[PDB]
Coordinates of C-alpha atoms in Angstrom, one line a residue:
X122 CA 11.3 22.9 3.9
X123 CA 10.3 24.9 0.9
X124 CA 6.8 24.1 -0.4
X125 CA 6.2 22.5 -4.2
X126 CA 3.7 24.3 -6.3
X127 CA 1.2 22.4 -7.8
X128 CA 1.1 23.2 -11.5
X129 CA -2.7 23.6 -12.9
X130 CA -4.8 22.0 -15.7
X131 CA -7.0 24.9 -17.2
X132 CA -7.2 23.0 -20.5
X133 CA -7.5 19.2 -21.0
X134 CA -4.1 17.1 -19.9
X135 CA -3.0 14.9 -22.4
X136 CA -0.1 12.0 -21.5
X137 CA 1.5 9.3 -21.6
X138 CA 2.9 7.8 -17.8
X139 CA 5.1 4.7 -17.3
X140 CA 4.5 4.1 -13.2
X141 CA 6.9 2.7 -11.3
X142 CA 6.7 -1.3 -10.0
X143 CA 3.8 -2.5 -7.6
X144 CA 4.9 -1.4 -3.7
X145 CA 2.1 -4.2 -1.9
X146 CA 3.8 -6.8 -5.1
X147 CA 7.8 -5.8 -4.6
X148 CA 7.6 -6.3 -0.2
X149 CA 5.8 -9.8 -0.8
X150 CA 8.1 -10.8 -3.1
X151 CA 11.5 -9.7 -1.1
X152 CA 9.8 -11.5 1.9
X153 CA 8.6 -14.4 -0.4
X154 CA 12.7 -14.2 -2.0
X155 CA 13.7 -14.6 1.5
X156 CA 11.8 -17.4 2.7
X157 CA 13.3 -19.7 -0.3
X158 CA 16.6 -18.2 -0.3
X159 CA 16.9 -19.1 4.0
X160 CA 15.0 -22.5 3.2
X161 CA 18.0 -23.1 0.9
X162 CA 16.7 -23.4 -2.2
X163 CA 18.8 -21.1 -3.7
X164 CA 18.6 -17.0 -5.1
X165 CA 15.3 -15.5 -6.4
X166 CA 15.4 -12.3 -8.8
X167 CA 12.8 -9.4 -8.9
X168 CA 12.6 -7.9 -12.0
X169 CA 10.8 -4.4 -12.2
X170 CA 11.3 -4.0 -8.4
X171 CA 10.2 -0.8 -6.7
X172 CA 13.0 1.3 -5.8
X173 CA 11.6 3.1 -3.0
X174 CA 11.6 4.2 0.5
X175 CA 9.7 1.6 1.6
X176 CA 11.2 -1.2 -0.5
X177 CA 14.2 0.5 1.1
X178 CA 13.4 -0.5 4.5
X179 CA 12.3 -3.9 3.5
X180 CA 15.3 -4.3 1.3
X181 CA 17.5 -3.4 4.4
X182 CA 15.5 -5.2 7.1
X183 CA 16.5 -8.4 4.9
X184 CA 19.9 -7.9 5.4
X185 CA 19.7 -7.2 9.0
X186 CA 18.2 -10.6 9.3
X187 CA 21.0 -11.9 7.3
X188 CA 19.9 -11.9 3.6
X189 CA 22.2 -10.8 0.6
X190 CA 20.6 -8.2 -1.8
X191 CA 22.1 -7.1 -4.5
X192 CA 20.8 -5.0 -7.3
X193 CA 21.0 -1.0 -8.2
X194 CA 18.0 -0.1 -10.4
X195 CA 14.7 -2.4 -11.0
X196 CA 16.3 -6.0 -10.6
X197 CA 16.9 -7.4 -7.5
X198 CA 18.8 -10.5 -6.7
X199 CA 17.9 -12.2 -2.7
X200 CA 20.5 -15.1 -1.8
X201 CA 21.6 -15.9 1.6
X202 CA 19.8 -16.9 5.1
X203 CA 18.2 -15.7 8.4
X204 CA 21.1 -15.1 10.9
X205 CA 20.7 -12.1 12.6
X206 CA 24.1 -11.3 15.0
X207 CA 23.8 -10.4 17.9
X208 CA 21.7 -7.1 18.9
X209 CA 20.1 -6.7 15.7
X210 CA 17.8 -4.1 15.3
X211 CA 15.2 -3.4 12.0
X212 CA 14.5 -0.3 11.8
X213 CA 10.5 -0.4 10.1
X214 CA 10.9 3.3 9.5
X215 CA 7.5 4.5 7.3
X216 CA 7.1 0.7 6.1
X217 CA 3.9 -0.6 7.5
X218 CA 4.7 -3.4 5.8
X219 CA 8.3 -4.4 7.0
X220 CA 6.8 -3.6 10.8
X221 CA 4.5 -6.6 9.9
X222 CA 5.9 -8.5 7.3
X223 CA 9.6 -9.4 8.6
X224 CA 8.7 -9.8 12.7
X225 CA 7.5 -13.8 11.7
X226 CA 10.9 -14.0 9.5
X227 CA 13.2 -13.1 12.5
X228 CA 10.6 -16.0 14.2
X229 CA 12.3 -18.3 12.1
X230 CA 15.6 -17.1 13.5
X231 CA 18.2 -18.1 16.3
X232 CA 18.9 -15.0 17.9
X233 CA 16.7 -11.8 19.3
X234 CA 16.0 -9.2 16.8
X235 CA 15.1 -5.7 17.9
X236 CA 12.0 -3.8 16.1
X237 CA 12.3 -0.2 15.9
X238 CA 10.9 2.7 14.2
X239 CA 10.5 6.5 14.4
X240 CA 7.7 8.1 16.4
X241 CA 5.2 8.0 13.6
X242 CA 6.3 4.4 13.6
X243 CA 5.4 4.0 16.9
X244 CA 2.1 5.1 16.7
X245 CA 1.3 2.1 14.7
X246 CA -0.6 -0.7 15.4
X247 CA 0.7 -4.0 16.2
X248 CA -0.4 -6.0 18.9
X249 CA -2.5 -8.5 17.8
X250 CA 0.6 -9.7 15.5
X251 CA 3.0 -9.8 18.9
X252 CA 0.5 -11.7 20.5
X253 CA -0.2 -14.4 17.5
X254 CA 3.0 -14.9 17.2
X255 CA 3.5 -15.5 21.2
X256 CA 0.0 -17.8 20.5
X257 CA 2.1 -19.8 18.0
X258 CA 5.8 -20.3 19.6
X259 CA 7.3 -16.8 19.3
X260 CA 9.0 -15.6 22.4
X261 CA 8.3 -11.7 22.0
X262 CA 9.5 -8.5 24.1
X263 CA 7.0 -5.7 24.3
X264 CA 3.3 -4.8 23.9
X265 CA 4.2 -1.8 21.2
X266 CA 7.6 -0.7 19.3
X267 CA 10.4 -1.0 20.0
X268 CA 9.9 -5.2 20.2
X269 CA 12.2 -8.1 20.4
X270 CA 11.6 -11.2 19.1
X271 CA 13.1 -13.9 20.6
X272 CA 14.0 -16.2 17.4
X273 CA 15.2 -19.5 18.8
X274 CA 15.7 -21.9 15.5
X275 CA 12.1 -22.5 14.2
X276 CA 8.0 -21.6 14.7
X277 CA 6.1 -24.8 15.8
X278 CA 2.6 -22.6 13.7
X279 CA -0.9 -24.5 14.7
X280 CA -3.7 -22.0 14.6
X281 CA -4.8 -18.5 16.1
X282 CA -7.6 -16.7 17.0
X283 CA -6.5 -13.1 15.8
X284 CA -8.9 -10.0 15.2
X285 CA -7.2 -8.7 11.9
X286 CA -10.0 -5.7 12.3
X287 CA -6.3 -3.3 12.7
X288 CA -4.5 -4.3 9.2
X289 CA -4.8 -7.1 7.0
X290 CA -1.1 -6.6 7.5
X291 CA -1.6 -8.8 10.1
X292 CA -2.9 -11.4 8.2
X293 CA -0.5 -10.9 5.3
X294 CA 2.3 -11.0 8.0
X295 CA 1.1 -14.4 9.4
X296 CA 0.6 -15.8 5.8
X297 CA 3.7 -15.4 3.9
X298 CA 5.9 -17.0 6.3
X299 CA 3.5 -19.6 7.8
X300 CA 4.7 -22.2 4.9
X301 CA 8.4 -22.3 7.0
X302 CA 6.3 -23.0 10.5
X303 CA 6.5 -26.5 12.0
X304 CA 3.0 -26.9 12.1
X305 CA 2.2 -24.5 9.4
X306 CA -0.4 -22.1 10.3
X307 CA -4.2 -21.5 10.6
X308 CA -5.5 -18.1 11.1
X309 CA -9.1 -17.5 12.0
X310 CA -10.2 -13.8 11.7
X311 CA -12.9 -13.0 13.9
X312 CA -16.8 -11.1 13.4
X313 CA -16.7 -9.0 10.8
X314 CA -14.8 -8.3 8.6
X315 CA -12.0 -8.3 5.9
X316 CA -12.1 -4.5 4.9
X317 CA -8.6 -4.6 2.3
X318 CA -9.3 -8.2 1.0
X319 CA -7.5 -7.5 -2.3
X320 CA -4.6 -7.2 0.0
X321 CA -4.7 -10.7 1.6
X322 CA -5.8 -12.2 -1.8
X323 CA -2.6 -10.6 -3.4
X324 CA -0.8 -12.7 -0.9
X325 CA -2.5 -15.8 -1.3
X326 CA -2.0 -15.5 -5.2
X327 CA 1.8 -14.9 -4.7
X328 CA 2.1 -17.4 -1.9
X329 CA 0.3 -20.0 -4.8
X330 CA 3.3 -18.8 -7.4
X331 CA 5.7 -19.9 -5.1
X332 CA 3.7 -23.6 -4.7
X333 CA 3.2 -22.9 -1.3
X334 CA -0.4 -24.7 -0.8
X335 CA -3.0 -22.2 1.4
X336 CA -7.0 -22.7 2.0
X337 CA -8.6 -19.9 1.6
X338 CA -12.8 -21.2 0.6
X339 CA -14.1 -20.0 3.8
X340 CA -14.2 -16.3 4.7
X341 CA -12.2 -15.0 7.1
X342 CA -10.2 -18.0 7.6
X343 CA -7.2 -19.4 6.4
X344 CA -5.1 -22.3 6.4
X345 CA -1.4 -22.8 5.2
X346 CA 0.6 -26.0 5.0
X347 CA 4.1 -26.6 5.7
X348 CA 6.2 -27.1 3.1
X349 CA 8.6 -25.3 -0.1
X350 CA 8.9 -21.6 -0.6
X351 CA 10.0 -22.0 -4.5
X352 CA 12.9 -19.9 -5.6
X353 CA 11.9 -18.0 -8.5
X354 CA 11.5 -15.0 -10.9
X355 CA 8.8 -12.1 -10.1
X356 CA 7.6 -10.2 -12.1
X357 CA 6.3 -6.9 -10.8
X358 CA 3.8 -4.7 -12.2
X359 CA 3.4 -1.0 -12.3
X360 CA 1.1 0.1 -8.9
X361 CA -2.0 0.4 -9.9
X362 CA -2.9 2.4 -6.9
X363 CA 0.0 5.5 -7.7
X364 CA -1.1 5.1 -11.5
X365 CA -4.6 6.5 -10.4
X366 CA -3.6 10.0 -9.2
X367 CA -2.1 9.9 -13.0
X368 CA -5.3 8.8 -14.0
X369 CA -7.2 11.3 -11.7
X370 CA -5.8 13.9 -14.0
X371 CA -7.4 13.1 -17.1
X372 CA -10.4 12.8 -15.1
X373 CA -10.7 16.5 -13.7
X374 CA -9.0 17.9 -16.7
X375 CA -11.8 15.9 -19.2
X376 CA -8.4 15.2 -20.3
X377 CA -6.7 11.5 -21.6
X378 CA -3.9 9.7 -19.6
X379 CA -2.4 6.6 -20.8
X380 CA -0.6 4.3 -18.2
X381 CA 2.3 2.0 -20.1
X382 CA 2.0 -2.1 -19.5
X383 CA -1.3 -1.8 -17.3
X384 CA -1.4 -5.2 -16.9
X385 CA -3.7 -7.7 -18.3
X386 CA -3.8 -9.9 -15.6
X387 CA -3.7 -8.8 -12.3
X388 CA -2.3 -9.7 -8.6
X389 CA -4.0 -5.9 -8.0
X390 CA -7.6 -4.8 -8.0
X391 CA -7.7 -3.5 -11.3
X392 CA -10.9 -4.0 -11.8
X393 CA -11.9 -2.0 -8.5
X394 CA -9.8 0.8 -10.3
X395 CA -11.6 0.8 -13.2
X396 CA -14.8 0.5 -12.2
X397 CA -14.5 3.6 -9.9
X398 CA -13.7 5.4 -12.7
X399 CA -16.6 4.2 -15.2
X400 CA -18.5 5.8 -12.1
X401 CA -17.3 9.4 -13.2
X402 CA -18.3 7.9 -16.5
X403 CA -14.6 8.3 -17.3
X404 CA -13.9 6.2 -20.5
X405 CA -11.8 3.7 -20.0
X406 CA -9.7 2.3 -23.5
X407 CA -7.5 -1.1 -23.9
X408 CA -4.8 0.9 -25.6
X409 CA -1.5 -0.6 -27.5
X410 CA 0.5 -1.6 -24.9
X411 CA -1.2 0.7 -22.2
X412 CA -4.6 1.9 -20.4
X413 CA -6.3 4.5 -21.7
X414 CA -9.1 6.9 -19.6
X415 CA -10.5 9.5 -21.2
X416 CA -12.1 11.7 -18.8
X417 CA -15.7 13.1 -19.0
X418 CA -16.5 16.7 -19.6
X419 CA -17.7 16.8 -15.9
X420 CA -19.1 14.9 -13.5
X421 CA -21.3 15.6 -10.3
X422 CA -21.6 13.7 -6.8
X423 CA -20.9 10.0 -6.6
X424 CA -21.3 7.1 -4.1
X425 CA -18.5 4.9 -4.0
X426 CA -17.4 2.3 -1.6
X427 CA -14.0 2.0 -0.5
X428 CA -14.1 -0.9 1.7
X429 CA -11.8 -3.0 -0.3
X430 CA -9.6 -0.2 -2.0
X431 CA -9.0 2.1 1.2
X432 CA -5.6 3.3 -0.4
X433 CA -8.0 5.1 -2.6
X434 CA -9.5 7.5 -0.3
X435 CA -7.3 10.6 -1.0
X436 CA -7.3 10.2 -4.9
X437 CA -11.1 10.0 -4.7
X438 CA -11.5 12.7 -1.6
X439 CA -9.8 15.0 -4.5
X440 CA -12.1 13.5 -7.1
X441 CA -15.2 14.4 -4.8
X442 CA -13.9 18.1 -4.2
X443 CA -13.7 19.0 -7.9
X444 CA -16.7 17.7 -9.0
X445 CA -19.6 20.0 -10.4
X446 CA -20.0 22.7 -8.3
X447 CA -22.8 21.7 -5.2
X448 CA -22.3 17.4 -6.0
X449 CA -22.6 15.9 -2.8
X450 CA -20.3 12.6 -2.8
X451 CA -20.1 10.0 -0.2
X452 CA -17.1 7.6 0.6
X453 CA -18.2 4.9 2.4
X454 CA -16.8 1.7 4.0
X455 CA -13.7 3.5 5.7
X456 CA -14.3 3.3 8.9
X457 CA -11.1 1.2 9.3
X458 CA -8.9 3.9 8.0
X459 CA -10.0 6.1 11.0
X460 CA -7.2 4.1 13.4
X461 CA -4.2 3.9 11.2
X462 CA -0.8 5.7 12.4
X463 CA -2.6 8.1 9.8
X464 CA -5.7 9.0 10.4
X465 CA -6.5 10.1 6.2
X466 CA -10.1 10.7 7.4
X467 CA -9.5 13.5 9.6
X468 CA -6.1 14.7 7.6
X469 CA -8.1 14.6 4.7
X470 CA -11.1 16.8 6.0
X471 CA -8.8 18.7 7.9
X472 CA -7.4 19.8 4.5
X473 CA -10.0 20.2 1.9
X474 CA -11.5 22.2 4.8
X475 CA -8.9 24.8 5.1
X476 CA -9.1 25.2 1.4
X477 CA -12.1 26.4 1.5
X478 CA -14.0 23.1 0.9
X479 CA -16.2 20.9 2.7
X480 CA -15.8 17.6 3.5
X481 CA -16.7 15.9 7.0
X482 CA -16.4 12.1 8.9
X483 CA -19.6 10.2 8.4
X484 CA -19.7 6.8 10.4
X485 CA -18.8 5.1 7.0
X486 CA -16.4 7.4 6.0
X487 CA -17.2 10.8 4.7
X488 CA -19.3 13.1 3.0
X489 CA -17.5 15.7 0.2
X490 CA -19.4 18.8 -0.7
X491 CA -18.2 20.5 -3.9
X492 CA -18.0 24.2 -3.1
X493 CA -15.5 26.9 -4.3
X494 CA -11.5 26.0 -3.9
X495 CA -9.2 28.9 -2.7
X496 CA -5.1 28.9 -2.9
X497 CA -3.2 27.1 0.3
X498 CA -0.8 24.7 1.8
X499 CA -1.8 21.4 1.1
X500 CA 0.3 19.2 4.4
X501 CA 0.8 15.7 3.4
X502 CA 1.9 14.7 7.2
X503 CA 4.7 12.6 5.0
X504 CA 1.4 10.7 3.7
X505 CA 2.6 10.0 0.4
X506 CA -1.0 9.6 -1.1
X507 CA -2.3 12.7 0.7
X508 CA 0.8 14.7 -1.0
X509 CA -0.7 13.2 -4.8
X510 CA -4.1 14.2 -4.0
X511 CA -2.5 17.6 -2.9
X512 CA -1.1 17.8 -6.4
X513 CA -4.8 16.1 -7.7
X514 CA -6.5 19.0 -6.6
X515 CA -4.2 21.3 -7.5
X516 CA -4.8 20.4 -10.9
X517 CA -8.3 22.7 -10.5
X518 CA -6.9 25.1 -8.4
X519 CA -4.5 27.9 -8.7
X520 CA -2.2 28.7 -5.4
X521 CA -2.4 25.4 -4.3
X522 CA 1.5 24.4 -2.8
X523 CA 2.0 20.7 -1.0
X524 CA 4.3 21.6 1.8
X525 CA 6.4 18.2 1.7
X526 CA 6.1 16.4 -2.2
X527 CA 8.8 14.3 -0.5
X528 CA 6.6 12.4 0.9
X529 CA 6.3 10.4 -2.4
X530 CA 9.3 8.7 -1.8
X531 CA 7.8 6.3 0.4
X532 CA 6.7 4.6 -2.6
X533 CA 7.5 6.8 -5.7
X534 CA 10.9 8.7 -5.8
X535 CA 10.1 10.3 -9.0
X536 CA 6.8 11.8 -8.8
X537 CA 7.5 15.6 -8.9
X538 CA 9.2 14.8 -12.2
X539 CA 6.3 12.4 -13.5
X540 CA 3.9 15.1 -12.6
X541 CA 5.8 17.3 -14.2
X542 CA 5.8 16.1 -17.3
X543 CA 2.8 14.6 -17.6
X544 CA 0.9 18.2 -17.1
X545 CA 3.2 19.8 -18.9

């Protein structure tokens, strides 16, 4: 496939960027939508939706299950209930989140519903959810994808002992459908523990906006009663995460990027976000009706942990490669990452390397020396955040071409275009 150049910065970028809906808010909320609408309690609407490749998935795995969704642009309307026919197969495709999300939804069906995905797919882990689910009722078929789950009419729940070290996915999974078990559910997550705890916190929040009732004062464990998943309206907000290779730009350029309807209150670590960026001393600004960061003339070496915003990595592994020439940066707390379908700690070295930088794996994470750039093919393996920090550091650097900007897809269609205009 042809490669996309990635246009440079050589003066100060200046922009205003409206980001497209929240992709972690949009999946909760279609399996949240679900939930309600099979409980009977009528259609939900999501308004702001992600239209995406991996809302996509999500989107269609709900009406392999048997849910009706309806809606062409950023509103989406879920009606209908969980009756897969027979031989039903989901295909999870690049969705991490419909391989983990929709397995407990089939729990709560009648027939068997095949899992399936491509190879990359494949490669992903999932085990400990199988076996949970097995733990707690679910009659399951297989150890890796492709899986069957063996829905019979309901999910008794009680409690399990599951290592969620893998994905918070798992947890997430378990959580939003626990509400519709018999005896709802109680996961216990075991030693240590809960890299990505935004991302079970924006599940518990969501799960509360529904009036489903969940315990969460003691770490690592959880506790979900039985009872209503509340049809409703949600409300998505832009994703925070995407809205920071937008940000990244000012930040590298000394530039000023304004993000539209940055929201006030958050279901998002926002505040992670912007902290990570008063770190570079970037200035943030409360704008009218947007969030303004003004970035700083330069910048040198920073520590910054990642633990809890791993989807950062990229954005900031660019960040640490155009710093002052010689800043030694360290990314820590991303030792998790290193066992994902997508290894982004060895992609990522792997790539600033063969640019001429120099970034290597530390235990934690890694280490990002600042040394010359030189032009080259940034490969995003279809990682869609390793394509926008392609395009991040190409920002600095002349000759630098992502070979596959379609990658964005997975969770922003338009991003060429965005990019686009926002440098130019």
């Amino acid at each position: 496939m042809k490669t996309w150049p990635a246009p440079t910065a050589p003066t100060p970028v200046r922009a205003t960027v409206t980001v497209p809906g929240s992709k972690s808010q949009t999946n909760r909320a279609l399996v949240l939508a679900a939930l309600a609408a099979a409980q009977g309690r009528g259609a939900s609407t999501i308004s702001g939706a992600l239209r995406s490749r991996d809302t996509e998935l999500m989107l269609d795995a709900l009406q392999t299950l048997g849910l009706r969704v309806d809606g062409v642009g950023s509103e989406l309307t879920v009606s209908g209930r969980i009756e897969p026919g027979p031989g039903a197969r989901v295909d999870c495709g690049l969705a991490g989140t419909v391989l983990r999300f929709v397995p407990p939804l089939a729990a709560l069906g009648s027939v068997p519903v095949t899992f399936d995905g491509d190879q990359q797919a494949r490669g992903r882990p999932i085990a400990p959810l199988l076996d949970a689910l097995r733990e707690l009722g679910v009659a399951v078929d297989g150890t890796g994808l492709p899986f069957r789950v063996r829905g019979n009419g309901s999910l008794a729940g009680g409690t399990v002992a599951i290592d969620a070290s893998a994905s918070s996915q798992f947890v997430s999974g378990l959580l939003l459908s626990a509400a519709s078990f018999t005896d709802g559910l109680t996961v216990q997550h075991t030693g240590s523990s809960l890299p990505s705890a935004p991302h079970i916190a924006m599940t518990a929040a969501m799960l509360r906006q529904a009036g489903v009732d969940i315990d969460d004062s003691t770490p690592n464990r959880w506790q979900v009663r039985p009872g209503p998943v509340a049809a409703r309206r949600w409300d998505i907000e832009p994703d925070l995460t995407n809205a920071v290779a937008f940000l990244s730009a000012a930040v590298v350029s000394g530039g000023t990027v304004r993000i539209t309807g940055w929201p006030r209150v958050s279901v998002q670590p926002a505040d992670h976000i912007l902290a990570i960026l008063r770190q570079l001393n970037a200035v943030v600004i409360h704008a009218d009706s947007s969030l303004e960061v003004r970035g700083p003339t330069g910048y040198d070496g920073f520590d910054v942990d990642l633990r809890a915003v791993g989807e950062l990595t990229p954005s900031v592994a660019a960040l640490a490669a155009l710093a002052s020439p010689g800043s030694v940066s360290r990314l820590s707390g991303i030792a998790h990452l290193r066992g994902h379908e997508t290894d982004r700690l060895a992609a990522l070295s792997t790539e600033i390397n063969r640019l001429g930088g120099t970034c290597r794996e530390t235990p934690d994470g890694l280490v990002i020396t600042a040394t010359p750039l030189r032009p080259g093919i940034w490969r995003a393996y279809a990682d869609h955040r390793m394509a926008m920090a392609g395009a991040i550091i190409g920002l600095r650097v002349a000759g630098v071409e992502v070979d596959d900007i379609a990658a964005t897809t997975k969770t922003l269609p338009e991003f060429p275009r965005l990019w686009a205009e926002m440098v130019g």
